[PDB]
Design an enzyme around this catalytic site. Sequence first.
Site, PDB file in Angstrom:
ATOM      1  N   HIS A  74     105.361  69.802   3.050  1.00 33.22           N
ATOM      2  CA  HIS A  74     105.590  71.146   3.579  1.00 33.22           C
ATOM      3  C   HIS A  74     105.315  72.315   2.637  1.00 33.22           C
ATOM      4  O   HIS A  74     105.322  73.458   3.081  1.00 33.22           O
ATOM      5  CB  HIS A  74     106.973  71.274   4.244  1.00 33.22           C
TER       6      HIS A  74
ATOM      7  N   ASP B 190      94.805  67.471  22.363  1.00 30.81           N
ATOM      8  CA  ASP B 190      93.894  66.652  23.169  1.00 30.81           C
ATOM      9  C   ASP B 190      92.584  66.430  22.389  1.00 30.81           C
ATOM     10  O   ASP B 190      91.766  67.342  22.260  1.00 30.81           O
ATOM     11  CB  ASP B 190      93.615  67.350  24.502  1.00 30.81           C
TER      12      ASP B 190
END
Length: 437
Positions: A162, A384
């Site tokens: 992070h 996607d």
Amino acid sequence: MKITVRGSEMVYPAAETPRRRLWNSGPDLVVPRFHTPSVYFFRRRDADGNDLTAADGSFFDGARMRRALAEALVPFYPMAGRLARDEDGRVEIDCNAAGVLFQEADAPDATIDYFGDFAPTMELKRLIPTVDFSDDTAFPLLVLQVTHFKCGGVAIGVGMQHHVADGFSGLHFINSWADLCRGVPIAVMPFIDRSLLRARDPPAPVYPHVEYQPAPAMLSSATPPAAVAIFKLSRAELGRLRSQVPAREREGAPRFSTYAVLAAHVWRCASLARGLPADQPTKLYCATDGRQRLQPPLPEGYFGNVIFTATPLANAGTVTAGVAEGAAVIQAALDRMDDGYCRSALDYLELQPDLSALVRGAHTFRCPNLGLTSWVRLPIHDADFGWGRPVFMGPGGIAYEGLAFVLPSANRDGSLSVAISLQAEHMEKFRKLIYDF
């Protein structure tokens, strides 16, 4: 279940990228040291029964994916870097294009249904590449594993360090990687300059920043096992929970956010499940995106950490008295997170002798306290790659108690899920409280 790694290689950017040290702002520094895990699940059919296999017979082809990855690592080049420290010992991102790990794996005997409701149990850790953390500067900042299951399902496991970016920017990357795989160009290019979050000179905080102070301990006169579970609330059930909290009419204030109401409900159920007495202080950690709280707003595509934390804190008697009572405390904490508060936070962090001491861990969220993060307005189902949207995206294995996540539904039915970890005995109780309204 049985999973074998069938391939693993470092992937490097597809073109020349800037070699440089990237400065980390305060919010880029007060983050966990090890990879944050997330998992996507994909099915071979679209629930209308339609086969999602591509016309070329493909379904998550590692080669096409590795191709698109290397390409995304061009604009998102810091993702391909390593950690490092400057003269002063401040952690920064060495943008050396040392690449990101990509693995493919197989689960020969198991379908993705093995994972059931997809609760973030430690069973999910198997879906993300194992990292050797022996050297801060050795490990890649992003590891990825595509696992293929019996019956045609696929999981993508993501481990992201992070310091390079928060969840918002991480998703921007994942979604851009998927855009390129599906053959669509990146809509919003990343803006890479964290100096926009530098502290004022001289620093001038105007709040004490309760969010970085030590969490309350259990009142005084071996670590218990940590259970993880996920609970769905229908659009209708959430509506009913909301209607239990009177609109702020005589007040004139806006109605409580749905976030404040649901968070208060979870905080209440957790506190009841934990058996907190009324005089026990409890602190809730609510991560907040500063991107639009700062004024002027950061550039679209800003790449990094912009997390500021609201931490409502009350006696358990207040939280357990009712959802309305908790919601007021939470909404008040959220409401104070304006431009002034966020900029004050930057100054506060600049004054700290050691930022690593403010990093939150198991000790922060253990009973009586709690972390609650919402992913409801994150594009977590937009990944996607050319073979369909995920049916689920969630955290990839919670190791300790006291963390909760609110997840939107992939099918857009307006339902929400709460994934949470608690001590096992407390979870037994929580299961019977969360729907008790």
